[PDB]
């Protein structure tokens with residue numbers, strides 16, 4: 001079973017993490033936080049990020065994750081009214097780095113599809 | 117002269133103040149979406165120092181910081197506590213006071229602290 005890393009680590013994030021648990025071990029002062037998170041990132045097989053909300057922390061985890069050569073899945077909701085960053089959208093190669101647009105209600109159906 | 121990379125969230129007057137000061141010390145490289153990404157990565161690889169204004173939350177600024185760390189770049193993150201925001205623990209904890217620095221600043225001292233950083 002794969003070691004999974006979930007970025008930005010409320011009820012929607014808990015839904016993502018519960019579904020992630022069905023496929024593998026979800027591994028997930030300030031210096032200690034960073035060191036602990038980078039050690040988990042380094043040991044992950046799949047890195048999942050919910051990129052709807054602008055976040056320096058989520059972006060930094062993705063940047064380190066690409067440089068660590070991990071398989072990355074980004075989940076974005078266009079119904080939020082936001083336009084996803086050109087840097088995250090442009091990092092997508094449709095294979096080891098995918099950006100999936102989704103609706104709140106299809107988060108379980110999409111994760112099942114990705115992990116099967 | 118050295119190559120300098122600047123980034124900030126997509127306010128613009130402050131970024132122009134930072135870039136205008138950066139020009140004194142070197143060439144500011146950064147003054148469909150796949151093409152934006154590749155050009156940014158080439159510029160990141162060419163830079164000797166990466167400067168990010170990290171007051172405004174941004175997935176893009178974060179991602180460029182993540183990629184710069186793995187390219188072993190000299191990084192300066194500028195943060196304004198007077199914005200009322202609390203800087204991300206990830207970016208705060210990424211600093212080591214040497215190759216990756218996170219400096220708090222006030223709007224009025226942006227020219228003086230870039231002088232202190234690049235004159236050292």
Ligand SMILES: Cn1nc(-c2cc3ccc(C#N)cc3[nH]2)nc1NC1CCN(C(=O)c2cccc(Nc3ncccn3)c2)CC1
Nearest residue numbers: 085086087122123124125126131132135146147152176177
């Ligand atoms: C490379 N770079 N350069 C500067 C930079 C800021 C700045 C301010 C003042 C001056 C002066 N004088 C010069 C400046 N240069 N910011 C950056 N990176 C930022 C990283 C976060 N962003 C994103 O995630 C983002 C989000 C949505 C769309 C796009 N579209 C996009 N289109 C084309 C190119 C770049 N981006 C990007 C915005 C861009």
